[PDB]
Amino acid sequence: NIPTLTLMEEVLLMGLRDREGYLSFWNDSISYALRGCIIIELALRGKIRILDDSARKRFDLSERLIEVIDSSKTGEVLLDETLQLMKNDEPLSISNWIDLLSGETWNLLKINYQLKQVRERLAKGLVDKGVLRTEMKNFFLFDMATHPIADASCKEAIKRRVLSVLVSRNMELSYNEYFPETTSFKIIRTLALICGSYGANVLENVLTTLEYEKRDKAISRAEEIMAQFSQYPFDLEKETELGVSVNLNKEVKEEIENNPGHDLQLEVIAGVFEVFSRM
Amino acid sequence: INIPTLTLMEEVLLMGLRDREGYLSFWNDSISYALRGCIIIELALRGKIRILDDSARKRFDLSERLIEVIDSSKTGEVLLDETLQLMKNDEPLSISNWIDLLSGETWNLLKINYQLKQVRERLAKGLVDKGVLRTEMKNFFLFDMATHPIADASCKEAIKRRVLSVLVSRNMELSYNEYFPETTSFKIIRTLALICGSYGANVLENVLTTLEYEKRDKAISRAEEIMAQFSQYPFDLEKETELGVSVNLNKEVKEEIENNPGHDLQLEVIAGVFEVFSRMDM
Amino acid sequence: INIPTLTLMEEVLLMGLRDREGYLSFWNDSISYALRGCIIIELALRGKIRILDDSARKRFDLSERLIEVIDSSKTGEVLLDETLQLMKNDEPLSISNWIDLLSGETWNLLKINYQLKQVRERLAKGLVDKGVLRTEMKNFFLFDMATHPIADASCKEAIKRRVLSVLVSRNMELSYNEYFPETTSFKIIRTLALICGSYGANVLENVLTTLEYEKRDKAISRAEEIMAQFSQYPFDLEKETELGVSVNLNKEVKEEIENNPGHDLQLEVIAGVFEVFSRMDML
Amino acid sequence: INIPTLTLMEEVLLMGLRDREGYLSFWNDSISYALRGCIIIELALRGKIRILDDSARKRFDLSERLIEVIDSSKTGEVLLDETLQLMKNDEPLSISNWIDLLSGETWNLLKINYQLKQVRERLAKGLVDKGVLRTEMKNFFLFDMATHPIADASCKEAIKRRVLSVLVSRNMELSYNEYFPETTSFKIIRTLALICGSYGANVLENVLTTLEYEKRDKAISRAEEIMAQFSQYPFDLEKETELGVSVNLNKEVKEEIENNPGHDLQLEVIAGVFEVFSRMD
């Protein structure tokens, strides 16, 4: 079922350089996308679902309310702690959750939902996972913890998956220890990766190698897939004019068919995609 | 091209070198990586590489544009010649991609061999050969090592006065000497690269320490002006500084490039590399 | 009289500190060890220690001579207080030996809690408490860090002018400020200690790099001379210099000493420490 | 297997080292000289050589006497094996003549490659292999350089302990350890060889600086007496010390010679060497 790295962690990984240091200066765009991954992640793990009233249809996807379906611990603190919050509140919309957890809306009687030390906790988790090691750099006025990458294969595998969907003619996802051949919702997870990393604005980081025609094609293909998968139900009949991942429609159809009765959750991820494009 | 005797990596190395007990000078990742940006700039000023001339590039960052070999004849500088080797038989790669490989900043299993090794060693060898440094044996307990004290302090001074001329004089008016003749191609660019290289290596402050603090603070930020001005292409030579320092840079640069016509494809590389120096804090 | 706001440790450190991106300045064993030297010079001038007045000592290198606690009430400087507490209750030890222990350069396991942990950061907290440094948070991708940029650039300018007056100047004439008033006891000694600790810590050079080399060369040379002169007790205040730099040093130091009597058992400690700064090339 | 893990030259060189990193001594020509002295003391102890047993010898100083190779098999070390190389394939020479030759001090056209080269650096490798040093790559501004700080610090504390045992404490109770077990033969001749070697080499003072003025003078005095006493032969093991340090030395040396008997032609060599050590000052 569930892969080793969460989406938040793959997105974080997306902003780092292969050896030491970083590519993206830390902005609140990335910090907002990560809250998005959290919500996507909750839906994937069958813990939340779009609130089941047909009256939601009069509203945008991202304006639609979410329902805690299962409040049992998940393992992941960031996930668990937002879950906690959800279990104790009226059904709120996707957009509202993302705001509150970002500290981007202001609410008095909500004090407070804003998630704290996300960056740092994601990093600690990433050490425990063994993706990052810890190095103690020595500065002029203090010592400092530092987390350069330990396993390069991890970042490389993510890169290839992403490219598999957005440069290569036929998407063929590769697998490994962190992301096995048997993870449920495999294609949606990687789509979710691209859509997250687009709105965190860290997606272009994996594209800097490529020749110019291919970097263009990847970005447009990316916004193409954002257009499709931020409406519900998905438009799986619309064919790509580009020469890129021409079999995604087929491969998704085969995936949702073999995970039936999950529609009430796929719709939340779509709302989240909607928020990523609006950002 | 009129090439001066010292390469930029050499020039940047001397910026980071103490007068006495030079091996005790401060070495780190920053100054290391800057040196590789120098290689690239140097390559460009010798007409060996240029930006791959495809207008699609205009939609991407300077430091992310592909470069190509246009002359591969050996330069007679091992560090430059070695990198030409690698460039000459690879498909064209981006500016910041080259800097990364040559540094070993990237985990490409097929290009583990692109990292230049013993850059300091060779750079000091060349400085010894050029008569800037001497060699002398230094004695402690369990071993003797070769140290390289400075043989000609006038070499480095003539560099420092160049930096200063851009960074504290109302008007730059640079001075020449045997290593850096008034006859040299791109004297001003070569200087600004020196300054941008230094800033990236974090050795630019080294030469400013004696100045009264505001003349000093004006210099750092004039440099920062310079780096923003010249890490975009074409250069915006119409923005005048509000700082009273090298007021005449623009006038003088425009003249420089109104001669040596038709090297836009190569000036553009320099500006890409200047972009890398800017983001080196990351 | 009284003592200046900044300690010599704090002064040594500022000489090693860059204007922008200070956390990137060069840190190392040398600066670390020198700071221990400064601690003990500091206690000497504060009338807290002196050498043990046993005539036998005259047979041994200054850096090998035993020193004893004179009085041991808090100074307010946590780093001085802490080391004085160790000293307060132990057999008299030699100068170089204390410096070794307070650095943890010496392995003898019976004295492991003698090493002063957290010098850098405590000397930073000191400097912030002092006006000298602000503290603002800078964001890196993966974490945040407290940064300490210079609030009073004038403080470190004045330090640097004192070095220059001694070392670049036909006649040393010292400028004073609120950190270091004219009232300061042993103001010249304090200045020479600074130059010496700085030379040992290998940060003296960075104060001189903008000048013409004849002037830089001359200044390092004078600096060595000053070490030679003062790494012996009593001080050879009679050697004329032939470099034409701080030509008036002997006269003013003499005058400083006469005007401040019966501190030889303290002055001597300083000669010791100066000896140790001389030998630091051996770390 | 009854030889200790470290040779006397390794311990003499070790004495020149600061506890963690760096040196207390400049490398010079007398430390260099003593080391060759040690080689010879080392070889006598391992029963590889002895003074040649001619009557004529008595009419000469100990260091002016000749020595003969008894057994010349390997010892595992590079510096002991090499000198045996030259010693085995050559006519009997005086012990001081040997020290002179190996160190490059006298000149000799018919024996010109007898100077042991890279002694300093070859001794360091052995120390590394013995795990007394590690090797640590350092970056200066123009090159990389391998440096050898201390790895096992306790080795060197145990040495400082022995030396302080016979030079400082009223009674002497040598402490044993991994590197220098209680069952190593000639435990004390070796300890003195050590304090003598150092004295000559001039690194002895380096383990004393830690102590009271009086205790420091006494230590040196004691070393000089031991030097005086053990550079004659047979040793006057009945001269008594008027300075209350290491008072049971004689008694303890006695039990040592008694316990390992019929080695007199080897001790004589080490006495000879002690004489070369006292005559460099």
UniProtKB/Swiss-Prot annotation, chain B:
GO terms for cellular component: cytoplasm; cytosol; Golgi apparatus; Golgi cisterna; Golgi cisterna membrane; Golgi medial cisterna; Golgi membrane; nucleus. Keywords: Golgi apparatus, Lipid-binding, Membrane, Phosphoprotein, Protein transport, Transport. GO terms for molecular function: enzyme binding; phosphatidylinositol-4-phosphate binding. Residues 136-147 are annotated as: Beta-hairpin required for oligomerization. It is found in: Golgi apparatus, Golgi stack membrane. Changing residue 117 to A: Abolishes phosphoinositide binding and Golgi localization. A 1,2-diacyl-sn-glycero-3-phospho-(1D-myo-inositol 4-phosphate) binds at residues 27, 36, 117, 120. It is a peripheral membrane protein. One of its GO terms (biological process) is Golgi vesicle budding. Changing residue 120 to A: Abolishes phosphoinositide binding and Golgi localization. Present with 1850 molecules/cell in log phase SD medium. Phosphatidylinositol-4-phosphate-binding protein that links Golgi membranes to the cytoskeleton and may participate in the tensile force required for vesicle budding from the Golgi. Thereby, may play a role in Golgi membrane trafficking and could indirectly give its flattened shape to the Golgi apparatus. May also bind to the coatomer to regulate Golgi membrane trafficking. May play a role in anterograde transport from the Golgi to the plasma membrane and regulate secretion. Homotetramer. Interacts with coatomer complex. May interact with ARF1. Belongs to the GOLPH3/VPS74 family. This is Vacuolar protein sorting-associated protein 74. It comes from Saccharomyces cerevisiae (strain ATCC 204508 / S288c) (Baker's yeast).
